[PDB]
Amino acid sequence: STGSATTTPIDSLDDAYITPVQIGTPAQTLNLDFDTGSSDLWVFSSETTASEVDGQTIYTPSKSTTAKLLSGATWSISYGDGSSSSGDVYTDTVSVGGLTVTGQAVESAKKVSSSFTEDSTIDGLLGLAFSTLNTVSPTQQKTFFDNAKASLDSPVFTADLGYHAPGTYNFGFIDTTAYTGSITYTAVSTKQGFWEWTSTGYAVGSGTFKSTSIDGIADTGTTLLYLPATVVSAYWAQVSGAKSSSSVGGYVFPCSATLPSFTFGVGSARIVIPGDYIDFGPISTGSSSCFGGIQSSAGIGINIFGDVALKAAFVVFNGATTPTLGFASK
Numbered sequence: 526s527t528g529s530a531t532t533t534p535i536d537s538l539d540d541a542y543i544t545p546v547q548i549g550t551p552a553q554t555l556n557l558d559f560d561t562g563s564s565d566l567w568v569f570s571s572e573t574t575a576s577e578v579d580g581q582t583i584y585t586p587s588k589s590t591t592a593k594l595l596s597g598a599t600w601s602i603s604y605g606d607g608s609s610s611s612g613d614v615y616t617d618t619v620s621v622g623g624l625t626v627t628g629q630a631v632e633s634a635k636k637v638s639s640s641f642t643e644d645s646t647i648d649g650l651l652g653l654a655f656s657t658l659n660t661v662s663p664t665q666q667k668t669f670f671d672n673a674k675a676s677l678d679s680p681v682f683t684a685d686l687g688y689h690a691p692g693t694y695n696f697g698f699i700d701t702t703a704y705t706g707s708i709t710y711t712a713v714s715t716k717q718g719f720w721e722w723t724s725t726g727y728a729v730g731s732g733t734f735k736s737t738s739i740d741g742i743a744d745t746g747t748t749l750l751y752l753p754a755t756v757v758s759a760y761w762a763q764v765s766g767a768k769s770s771s772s773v774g775g776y777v778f779p780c781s782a783t784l785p786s787f788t789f790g791v792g793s794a795r796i797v798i799p800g801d802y803i804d805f806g807p808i809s810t811g812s813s814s815c816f817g818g819i820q821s822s823a824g825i826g827i828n829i830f831g832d833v834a835l836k837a838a839f840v841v842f843n844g845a846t847t848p849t850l851g852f853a854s855k
């Protein structure tokens with residue numbers, strides 16, 4: 526089997542991407558944020574504290590003839606940005622772009638934090654990292670991909686995120702028309718539960734490529750590109766007037782600037798992130814100071830190849846017995 530669904534930026538800055546998902550019988554369609562950096566499929570629901578719902582579409586398990594309460598199961602997750610959510614668990618039928626999993630754990634939110642309440646466009650998250658990160662207790666649950674994998678034509682999914690435009694998530698096949706050149710595959714460590722790999726280096730604009738190992742994660746659920754302070758300083762040094770602002774929480778730059786590209790290495794291959802992908806607009810409405818899309822990972826503890834990086838590429842998440850990642854230009 527295979528599945529294919531369109532993913533759409535939630536706003537004009539590509540702050541996140543939402544993908545429609547069918548849950549239950551009859552189908553309830555929710556727009557979920559496909560997140561290769563976490564492993565819980567959780568949703569706004571009829572159980573969510575009412576003051577914490579502000580425009581989201583909710584899953585109502587009582588209206589699904591295939592929903593079953595998973596007895597005694599709860600979940601609770603906290604992310605590095607400080608956001609969180611928690612609740613109970615149902616199993617139900619979940620479909621993505623034609624690919625169906627029965628008995629998928631659907632984690633129903635009783636509580637969500639302010640960042641989630643404030644994003645009316647995101648009805649929940651669909652985790653695509655490794656199932657070892659799943660938070661359901663006392664019995665850990667599997668991701669959608671883990672559940673679907675054996676049935677797929679090939680045990681893979683691909684992310685093709687658009688810049689200011691829709692893109693595609695495919696499950697079970699590689700669309701050879703969706704990229705240019707070849708796909709370069711690179712080794713993955715699953716030890717931290719992430720799609721963790723090692724970039725071979727970087728360049729800033731038309732500058733010389735610096736060969737250096739940068740370990741980090743391929744994370745569709747993080748907006749920005751978080752890299753070591755040395756690398757980030759080298760990038761922003763090329764933008765006149767750019768500075769790290771403690772008050773704003775990272776590098777900012779004059780909105781009148783033309784940003785250089787940023788290149789990262791995948792083996793001998795090179796993915797080029799155009800400069801405009803790195804512009805995240807005024808820090809506050811009407812400001813002429815703009816927020817940068819490349820920021821320091823110092824204090825995260827890991828580097829994160831988030832949407833800013835991934836949207837410059839066609840990305841293969843290969844869930845073969847030894848997982849790997851593939852990157853192609855497009």
Ligand SMILES: CCNC(=O)c1c(-c2ccccc2)csc1NC(=O)CNCCc1c[nH]c2ccccc12
Binds near residue numbers: 604641747826827829
């Ligand atoms: C800044 C978002 N990323 C993280 O927190 C994160 C971290 C992390 C750890 C410590 C400090 C900062 C970041 C490691 S892996 C990792 N990746 C994820 O956690 C992926 N899931 C993001 C879920 C998420 C958090 N806030 C949102 C708001 C809208 C849509 C999705 C979200």
